[PDB]
Amino acid sequence: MAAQLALNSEASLWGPYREIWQTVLSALIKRQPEAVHSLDIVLKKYKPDFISLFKNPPKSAQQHERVQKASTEGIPIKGTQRTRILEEQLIKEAFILSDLYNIGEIAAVELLLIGEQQQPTFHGLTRGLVAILLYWDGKSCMAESLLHLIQARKPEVVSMVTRFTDDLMELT
């Protein structure tokens, strides 16, 4: 507990997935040259997402002793928009469903709270099933972003974009 407070700072958690899209949408679809200057910071700060959309890592029984008990000591979601103390049904979704397409408990709520936003806003779709749709819709935009990035790669930065896409092609 006194252990994850000394970690002074790190950029963000799931805001990227939305901040990238608006930065990618602005740099590519909106055609802003001051955006592509910031894109020289976004494109590859979030390279582990374009490589593996909905990626996974490694989780063990020692991490269980960090979080102690989720109910007793609330899990530290480092970001939220609508407060919601989480139940016992979410821990059973953390241990099981994260052994699958692997979202994660903290990321299971950020998905529900995004689904809770468009629960009646999107037509005929209930909370749990909106979260399944905006999860596949976030990756479609995550891949449509990567396409429109490469379509542009063949007027100044074109020689910078081409040289960096050749090295990346040079992984497969």
Q: Which residue ranges make up the site for another protein (CB under 8 A)?
A: 2-4, 6-7, 10-11, 40-41, 43-45, 47-48, 57-58, 66, 117-121, 123-124, 168
Least distance to another protein, CB of residue 159, Å: 11
Least distance to another protein, CB of residue 162, Å: 15
Question: Using CA atoms, how far apart are residues 70 and 74, in angstroms rounded to an integer?
Answer: 5
Q: For residues 79 and 92, which CB has a smaller minimum distance to another protein in the complex?
A: 79
Least distance to another protein, CB of residue 48, Å: 7
Q: For residues 135 and 164, which CB has a smaller minimum distance to another protein in the complex?
A: 164
Q: For residues 37 and 92, which CB has a smaller minimum distance to another protein in the complex?
A: 37
Amino acid 68 reads Q
Q: Which residues contact 16 (CB under 8 A, 6 or more apart)?
A: 45, 46, 49
3 state DSSP class of 102: coil
Q: What number of CA atoms fall less than 13 Å from residue 159's CA on the CB side?
A: 2
Least distance to another protein, CB of residue 91, Å: 20
Q: For residues 61 and 88, which CB has a smaller minimum distance to another protein in the complex?
A: 61
Amino acid 5 reads L
- Number of C-beta neighbours around residue 122 at 10 A: 13
